[PDB]
């Protein structure tokens, strides 16, 4: 059909068809009269997977012959989403399969919709991981993602009476044709026990053994025939485990619970033992795989020239004392040498500065669960603190601040401090977040070792986040400037010479209008809800968090509503405000925010005076595959976190790429986005980071805003009095109370300037042609935000390897 | 190589080879340089499974077009063993695959050894089930096996210091290429709740839901292109299950524990709740499958003309009140009509008369777990007892004996009584066991309904139990009389005209000697143990049980040993005595017996005076695949249960088929075996059933035998004094105590005649040529004992359907 989707040749189409039929019959054991859409999706999936394997084998073979330096990306999260379309796209099979399946009388799109998301992640962190593996493959890096194969991913969100209900995401119910179980590289992981000292060093003994079985899933590069591996571990009990008899067998579940469910907090940190076991599990099994792969090439000097380990936040920070444990206790290197190898291997990416988000493990936990690692960590601390004393003699306060060990009611190990100490590079995820790191929470560590601190502004993959979810926009871009930009997204700049081209202007706007028409229909079919597709589409999608200030959005919505009820016969640009996201299950406030949003919907959406001028939709079960649908359909992107809190953000990037304009604060990557497009082409409002500080020193008194803004006073009055909850008039007193007395995020301080800026958005939207020209300026400058750029920067400046864009043979 | 293994044509061989290579690459994602034997076994397995599926689909299609009456075989046990070779054999692919794999430079036999047993059974009962499914397919019956897909089967038995250790049989570790998950026919099963009465009848409510997911495994008939289905259910939790959040997800294991492990008792009955849930699970999910399949053909009159349900013992007896529940409560038939349908559908096979083996469920259990079924059972009882009163007025004792409900400290439901009441046929499993049923435990029920009681002597499948495990013997048979006998085993009779044929005599003996030479080697390679292959091979293999009187064997062994130490320079026919079997984990005595056997081994096997004249081996991990090896290699078969206790036995049949002579008592099928071969061709000793009764009425006093047999007194003295346990001299006091004061099985009563008869075995063995001629008479008369005969008898006399030997098209 459209050109970026590859060739539908007569060979390939005829061949796809017979392989589809072979799978349907031999693999699925069905015939065309009993097959359901789910069987059809499978046959297609097995058929496409057939095109990977040849390439997959040759890629692993290549890395053996060539023995390049290897990148190991350790993450507890890999938010993959669906695999089928991505695979076709990267393999140039999209038009072929589409043709083949059409001729068999099937609609491919209907089949794509049957695939479960692999929701092995909560949000931006696990999805960074996913974009990174795609980019690593595309750039021919010899990279492996390592994580955990959770039996249940992020929960599916149902709304009942406007409250979030969580249900189990049983994504493996029907099988996963993408993975390959490799029970033959099963590895032991040890827990508990005790440390014994001998003539010949420490020995960790009387431990419980849990086996780690790996599953491999192919990661295909973009049209370069590189296929890398994501290896996820699964917990299995040993056969002599516990081994009255029945219970012994039934208790095998106790071990395998390790990889059973993904922790769904991204706000808070809970010191729960299961979580720590998960972190150790992945790190222990991964290091033996890394070490084994290295030995098949006594001398660990070369280890750092052959291995790079990137730590996605501090979740796999135990890699550091685990690498010492192996080197010192099992391979018998002296401390000082093993330490040099360790620091030179490991690097650390921090994803937040929120204090409640940082891992601080109780010592009593590490002591029972991992007693030798505790010894190592203490020995690490001591030697570290002697470096500090030597560099800053007399400074005893610096000593207590920098310690890996927090003194207090319960002793804690600060896992960030460990990562900084044991890594040669530490990075933030956007320029401003990186400066904040050096100026505030890691300032002490920066003065000791300024050379460790870097920046690597996040990016997203334009294969998933443009070609895949937005084929129409990819096409019109390709018509003008070619296809090269799909893996060199800087070329999008060439679009700046089309900014006064009437034919492009109509085409950009035409595509936006289609994506809206299509999403508007998805809203009716799957969820019986009625939207005007000529309205502006105002979307905030991301996890629910106080810092992300969905509440601020709510306040705007309520204000537009109140202005409309005040002058009903005045013209306002209509809007459909969509807000969607999951709340972590114990985060009471977050859950109240979801409730408020639906409450506003019940009032606003059924007011006959409002008409179709304002609609408020909460988007159920936001996740990767819903993001691929709503992002191409959006006009306004809401990125409105209090300055200084959102480390980078990546949703913001997906929207810029797809023709939405951004309303946001100068926070995280928003800053570089505006810098790249010009501030004129951006809707910036609110305090900068400096303003927030000034406010913290005076003290933030919310009353002041309430006393001076009548429009705001009215909203609080409505919330307090029961306007939005006529059955429970006091339903929202917690929010009204938080807003008024302990808002760490200064919702009221930004309200005035946020509303004024929202008025400027409506004004520009009334002039279609200038709206679109601004869109063009955004899309045209979104190049920097490709995860290809990001990965090339890690590669060159942290891992010490060259990206290569060259094909491998077919 | 040999003719019964089919054609190795040039088409098939070349085609096997490329499919093997396709699977190795596409399915297993390996290449010839990294492949391990396990990968090779898989590729072969997937290649052979490819030849089933076409046939499998056409068989299920046929049954739809033709709509014949359907047999549902309900069992908690299916002891399948390995599937690969059986599949090749039934499909005529053995010589082809052997050729193909040879040309790829592989040894097929080495590959066959890598396959796990599906040990979804304990012993004869679950293996009857397996032989029956093979025979049902071979006879073109539209039959389905239904059971449970246990995650762990019968435990693997290790010996440590001569004690049994149990470890978990994790038979699914590496995948099972034979099954097909069919998540789309998932079915709800309900538990707990309570019964509510309405205007419109009872309603079972507030129940917990457990889902049953079916797995299908192909059951290929012998060279007729019929492939039937074994459907095994797997327990899965629902997604809103329990649905702080973490525990909710972790507690999903509580539901799925249902299908987690197979109960390994075959002696005793434990009223454990998990077991009852297993029995209900299988019965509830199976009945909806049966009912659904029936509706796709309001009127249940035809139900019994379209459905037959065979109950393998009382384990799935809840099928009966479950069928009433559905008919009465969900489809709204009146009692009397639903009852007629039920009795006409169901039949019951009893497998034992041992009182501790019978299921008697506590009422408090059924009341909490299945409260409506309890109501039904009471209503069944009442109506049943009114039939009894009417037929035997005044007989109040008969009323208490016949009741489904046992009065007592805790009320129990007698599940046998339920099966008899709710079934149109009840059968024993050998002629003598069937008479015992009618004369003793079911006598009351027989006088009420003599027409319900039948016999169906057990059988075994000659495909697995001859062609497969003994290709050499199958060949020489085929040389003389053709191949037709493989599915018409009566033709083995034609061998009686070769009894004086010198060339056959040498060939029969030649094969026996090979199987011995080969097993003798298997003993060294896998278990470092040293046997003389010219000795007589004396084997007792079967579960360890007091009734099966392994102890009696021990006493003989010890006696041969003591006679040898008394006259060391006298000639005795050498023997290798092998005894093997698992003990149920809580059966303390059984476990002591294993211990004794190894103790005898430690003394006997290291006496230099004994030489290689006597060896005593305990065979570790006896199971289906070890049976396929040791049975062809045996000379003497030990079937020595106290008369009246072994309902039928089937090991006895496997040995007759494979050229061993039998030493045994007149118990179970032994009786019909001797009747078929002539008593002269059999080594019969000991009490008949009548003798046992006479002894029970006088009282069995073991002292008497001890006082009159010096050879016996000496053995007891040795056991008591520590001769076999020099470190723990009192190790065996429990056995010596049981033997002397409470042996329900009269080991001493049979000892004298058992030894005399063992002397007659040794005498005949010294004359090779007459030994073999007797073997010929056994093998030649083993026809009756084919499970094809058995199934044809169920078919004609219980199920009301005709066996058909006709091919279906290819
Ligand atoms: C000391 C160890 C404790 C770590 C606690 C944490 C954290 C997280 C950060 N981010 C986002 O990660 C994204 C990817 O970098 C960012 O764009 C976004 O700004 C982040 O909030 C998440 O999405 N989830 C998180 O849990
Ligand atoms: C009231 C319900 C309770 C049932 C309890 C039971 C039983 C069993 C019978 N048999 C054998 O089943 C075999 C197959 O019929 C026989 O040949 C052999 O003689 C039997 O002992 C077994 O092998 N295992 C058993 O558990």
DSSP string, A583-605: PPTT-HHHHHHHHHHHHHHHHHT
Here the tokens at position A322 are 């685990």
- Phi-psi domain of B166 (left: phi exceeds 0; alpha: psi -120 through 50; beta: other): beta
SS3 content of chain B, % helix, strand, coil (to 5): 50, 15, 30
In the block, residue with structure tokens 């081209």 = A501
- How many angstroms separate the CA atoms of A456 and A791, rounded? 9
- How many angstroms separate the CA atoms of B269 and A358, rounded? 55
Contacts of A589 by beta carbon, 8 Å cutoff, 6+ apart = A546, A734, A735, A738
- How many angstroms separate the CA atoms of A418 and A411, rounded? 15
Contacts of B150 by beta carbon, 8 Å cutoff, 6+ apart = B120, B259, B260, B261, B262
Binding-site sequence positions of B for AMP: 31, 64, 292-297
Please give the resolution of this entry in Å, rounded to 1 decimal. Answer: 2.7
Give, rounded to a whole angstrom, the gap between the first and last alpha carbons of chain B.
Answer: 25
Residue spans in chain B of domains classed CATH 3.40.50.2000: 1-459+787-810, 460-786
| CA-based max dimension of chain B | 90
In contact, A489 and A786? CB cutoff 8 Å: yes
In contact, B286 and B72? CB cutoff 8 Å: yes
Contacts of B259 by beta carbon, 8 Å cutoff, 6+ apart = B148, B149, B150, B151, B233, B234, B235, B278, B281
Question: Residue B456 catalytic?
Answer: no
SS3 content of chain A, % helix, strand, coil (to 5): 50, 15, 30
Phi first, then psi, for residue B315 (nearest 5°) are -55, -40
In contact, B645 and B750? CB cutoff 8 Å: no
Among B625, B621, B672, B626, CA closest to B646: B672
Phi first, then psi, for residue B293 (nearest 5°) are -65, -40
- How many angstroms separate the CA atoms of B593 and B91, rounded? 42
Among A796, A797, A802, CA closest to A451: A797
- How many angstroms separate the CA atoms of B264 and B257, rounded? 16
Among B77, B75, B169, CA closest to B123: B77
- How many angstroms separate the CA atoms of B202 and B371, rounded? 11
DSSP B88-105: HHHHT-HHHHHHHHHHTT
In contact, A83 and A464? CB cutoff 8 Å: no
Q: Residues near ligand 1 with C-beta < 6 Å?
A: A 122-125, 128, 266, 269, 313-314, 351-352, 357-359, 415-416, 429, 458, 646-650, 668
- How many angstroms separate the CA atoms of A119 and A168, rounded? 11
Give me the residue from A26, A50, A184 closest to B38, CB to CB. Answer: A184
- How many angstroms separate the CA atoms of B494 and B490, rounded? 8
Say if residue A202 is exposed, middle or buried (CB neighbours under 10 Å; 0-12, 13-18, 19+): middle
* Torsion angle (degrees, nearest 10) of CA A263, A268, A272, A278: 40
Measured from the CB, is residue B648 less than 6 Å from ligand 2?
yes
- Quote the DSSP letter at residue A573: -
Please, after which residues is chain A broken with C–N above 2.5 Å?
Answer: 243, 297
Q: Do A181 and B175 touch (CB under 8 A)?
A: yes
Phi first, then psi, for residue B100 (nearest 5°) are -55, -45
In contact, B622 and B573? CB cutoff 8 Å: no
Among A496, A491, A497, A459, CA closest to A478: A491
Q: Do A246 and B239 touch (CB under 8 A)?
A: no
Question: How many beta carbons lie within 10 A of that of residue A147, not counting itself?
Answer: 27
In the block, residue with structure tokens 């009353």 = A703
Among A238, A261, A263, CA closest to A251: A238
In contact, A84 and A45? CB cutoff 8 Å: yes
- How many angstroms separate the CA atoms of B210 and B241, rounded? 9
- How many angstroms separate the CA atoms of A360 and A363, rounded? 9
Give the Å distances, CA to CA, from B711 to B565, B607, B707, B725, B762: 13, 20, 10, 20, 19
Q: Do A54 and B25 touch (CB under 8 A)?
A: yes
Determine which residue's CA is closest to atom 5 belonging to ligand 1.
A357
**DSSP H helices in A422-461:** 431-439, 443-448
- What is the 3-state secondary structure of A274-317? HHHHHHHHHHHHHHHHHHHHHHCCCCCCCHHHHEEEEEECCCCC
CATH node for B1-459+787-810: 3.40.50.2000
In contact, A159 and A620? CB cutoff 8 Å: yes
In the block, residue with structure tokens 């579940």 = A253
In the block, residue with structure tokens 């470890």 = B167
Question: How many beta carbons lie within 10 A of that of residue A592, not counting itself?
Answer: 19
- How many angstroms separate the CA atoms of B231 and B286, rounded? 9
Angle CA A430–A436–A705, to nearest 5: 100
Here the tokens at position B613 are 């004249």
**DSSP H helices in B265-414:** 273-295, 303-306, 319-324, 335-345, 363-369, 371-391, 396-402
In angstroms, how far is CA A548 from the centroid of its own chain?
A: 15
Give the Å distances, CA to CA, from B72 to B80, B312, B331, B731, B796: 17, 11, 21, 49, 15
| CA-based max dimension of chain A | 90
- What is the 3-state secondary structure of A267-285? CCCCCCHHHHHHHHHHHHH
Contacts of A547 by beta carbon, 8 Å cutoff, 6+ apart = A354, A641, A642, A645, A646, A744, A745
In the block, residue with structure tokens 């937040």 = A352
- CA gyration radius, chain A: 27
- How many angstroms separate the CA atoms of B552 and B556, rounded? 7
How many CA atoms lie within 13 Å of A464's alpha carbon, on the beta-carbon side? 34
Of A543, A575, A773, A784, the active-site residue reads: A543
- Quote the DSSP letter at residue B595: H
Chain A interface test: which of B33, B59, B168 (most A C-beta within 10 Å): B168
Give me the residue from A53, A184, A241 closest to B26, CB to CB. Answer: A53
Q: Do A175 and B181 touch (CB under 8 A)?
A: yes
Of B149, B277, B548, B789, the active-site residue reads: B548
Among B48, B179, B28, B54, CA closest to B101: B48
Q: Which CATH superfamily is domain A460-786 in?
A: Glycogen Phosphorylase B; (3.40.50.2000)
Q: Do A243 and B167 touch (CB under 8 A)?
A: yes
In angstroms, how far is CA A720 from the centroid of its own chain?
A: 36
Question: How many beta carbons lie within 10 A of that of residue B521, not counting itself?
Answer: 12
- How many angstroms separate the CA atoms of B744 and B753, rounded? 19
Angle CA A314–A317–A322, to nearest 5: 175
DSSP B244-290: -HHHHHHTTHHHHGGGTB----SS-----HHHHHHHHHHHHHHHHHH
Chain B interface test: which of A18, A21, A29, A157 (most B C-beta within 10 Å): A29
Measured from the CB, is residue B649 less than 6 Å from ligand 2?
yes
- How many angstroms separate the CA atoms of B599 and B584, rounded? 20
**DSSP H helices in B346-501:** 363-369, 371-391, 396-402, 415-421, 431-439, 443-448, 462, 471-481
Among A349, A294, A289, A327, CA closest to A75: A349
Measured from the CB, is residue B646 less than 6 Å from ligand 2?
yes
| Angle between helices B710-721 and B550-566 in degrees, nearest 10 | 100
Contacts of A630 by beta carbon, 8 Å cutoff, 6+ apart = A519, A539, A541, A578, A580, A619
Give the Å distances, CA to CA, from B737 to B268, B585, B696, B703, B745: 21, 21, 19, 11, 14
- Phi-psi domain of B456 (left: phi exceeds 0; alpha: psi -120 through 50; beta: other): beta
Please tell me the experimental approach by which this structure was elucidated: X-ray
Tell me how many helices (H) and strands (E) chain A has.
33, 25
Binding-site sequence positions of A for AMP: 31, 64, 292-297
- Quote the DSSP letter at residue B305: H
How many CA atoms lie within 13 Å of B655's alpha carbon, on the beta-carbon side? 26
Chains A, B: CB contacts within 8 A come to 103
- Quote the DSSP letter at residue A568: T
């Amino acid at each position: 059909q459209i050109s970026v989707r590859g060739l539908a040749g007569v060979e390939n189409v005829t061949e796809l068809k017979k392989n589809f039929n072979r799978h349907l019959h031999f693999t699925l054991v069905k015939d065309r009269n009993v097959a359901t859409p789910r069987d059809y999706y499978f046959a297609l999936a097995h058929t496409v997977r057939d095109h990977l394997v040849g390439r997959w084998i040759r890629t692993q073979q290549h890395y053996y012959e060539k023995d390049p330096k290897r990148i190991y990306y350790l993450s507890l999260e890999f938010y993959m989403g669906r695999t089928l379309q991505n695979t076709m796209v990267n393999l140039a099979l999209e038009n072929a399969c589409d043709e083949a399946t059409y001729q068999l009388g099937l609609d491919m799109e209907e089949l794509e919709e049957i695939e479960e998301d692999a929701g092995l992640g909560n949000g931006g962190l696990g999805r960074l991981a996913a974009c990174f593996l795609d980019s690593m493959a595309t750039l021919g890096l010899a990279a492996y993602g390592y994580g955990i194969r959770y039996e249940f991913g992020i929960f599916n969100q149902k709304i009942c009476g406007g409250w979030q209900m969580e249900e189990a995401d049983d994504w493996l119910r029907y099988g996963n044709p993408w993975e390959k179980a490799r029970p033959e590289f099963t590895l032991p992981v040890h827990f508990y026990g005790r440390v014994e000292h001998t003539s010949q060093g420490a020995k960790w003994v009387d431990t419980q053994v849990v086996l780690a079985m790996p599953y491999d899933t192919p990661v295909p590069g973009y049209r370069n025939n590189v296929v890398n591996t994501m290896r996820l571990w699964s917990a299995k009990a040993p056969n002599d485990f516990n081994l009255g008899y029945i219970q012994a067998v039934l208790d095998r579940n106790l071990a395998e619970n390790i990889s059973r469910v993904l922790y769904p907090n991204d706000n808070f940190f809970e010191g729960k033992e299961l979580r720590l076991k998960q972190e150790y599990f992945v790190v222990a099994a991964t290091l033996q795989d890394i070490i084994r792969r290295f030995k098949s090439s006594t001398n660990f000097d070369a280890f750092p020239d052959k291995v790079a380990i990137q730590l996605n936040d501090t979740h796999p920070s135990l890699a550091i004392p685990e690498l010492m444990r192996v080197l010192v206790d099992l391979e018998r290197l002296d401390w000082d040498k093993a330490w040099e190898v360790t620091v030179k291997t490991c690097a650390y990416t921090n994803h937040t500065v929120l204090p409640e988000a940082l891992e601080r493990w109780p010592v009593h936990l590490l002591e029972t669960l991992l007693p030798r690692h505790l010894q190592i960590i203490y020995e690490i601390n001591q030697r570290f603190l002697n470096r500090v004393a030597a560099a800053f003699p007399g400074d005893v306060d610096r000593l207590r601040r920098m310690s890996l060990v927090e003194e207090g009611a319960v002793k804690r190990i600060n896992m960030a401090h460990l990562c900084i100490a044991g890594s040669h590079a530490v990075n933030g995820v956007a320029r401003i977040h990186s400066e904040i790191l050096k100026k505030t929470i890691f300032k002490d560590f920066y003065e000791l070792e300024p050379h460790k601190f870097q920046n690597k502004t996040n990016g997203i993959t334009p294969r998933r986040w443009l070609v895949l979810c937005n084929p129409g926009l990819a096409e019109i871009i390709a018509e003008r400037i070619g296809e090269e930009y799909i893996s060199d997204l800087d070329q999008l700049r060439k679009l700046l010479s089309y900014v006064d081209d009437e034919a492009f202007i109509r085409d950009v706007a035409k595509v936006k209008q289609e994506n809206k028409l299509k999403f508007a229909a998805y809203l009716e079919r799957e969820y019986k809800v009625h939207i005007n597709p000529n309205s502006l589409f105002d979307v905030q999608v991301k996890r629910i968090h106080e810092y992300k200030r969905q509440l601020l959005n709510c306040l705007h919505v309520i204000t537009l509503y109140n202005r409309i009820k005040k002058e009903p016969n005045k013209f306002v640009v209509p809007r459909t405000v969509m807000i969607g996201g999951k709340a972590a299950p114990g985060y009471h406030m977050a859950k109240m925010i979801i409730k408020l949003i639906t409450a506003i919907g019940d009032v606003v959406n059924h007011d006959p005076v409002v008409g179709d001028r304002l609609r408020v939709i909460f988007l159920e079960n936001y996740r990767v595959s819903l993001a691929e649908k709503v992002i191409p359909a959006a006009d306004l992107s809401e990125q409105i976190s209090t300055a200084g809190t959102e480390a980078s953000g990546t949703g913001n990037m997906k929207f810029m790429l797809n023709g939405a304009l951004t309303i946001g604060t100068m926070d995280g990557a928003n800053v570089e986005m505006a810098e790249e497009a010009g501030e004129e082409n951006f809707f910036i409002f609110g305090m900068r980071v400096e303003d927030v500080d000034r406010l913290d020193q005076r003290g933030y008194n919310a009353q002041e805003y309430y006393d001076r803004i009548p429009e705001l006073r009215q909203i609080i009055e409505q919330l307090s009095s029961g306007f939005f909850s006529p059955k429970q008039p006091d339903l929202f007193k917690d929010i009204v109370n938080m807003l008024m007395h302990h808002d760490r995020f200064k919702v009221f301080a930004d309200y005035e300037e946020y509303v004024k800026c929202q008025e400027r958005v409506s004004a520009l939207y009334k002039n279609p042609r200038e709206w679109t020209r601004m869109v063009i300026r955004n899309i045209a400058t979104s190049g920097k935000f490709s995860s290809d750029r990001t990965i090339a920067q890690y590669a060159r400046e942290i891992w010490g390897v060259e990206p290569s864009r060259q094909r491998l043979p077919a």
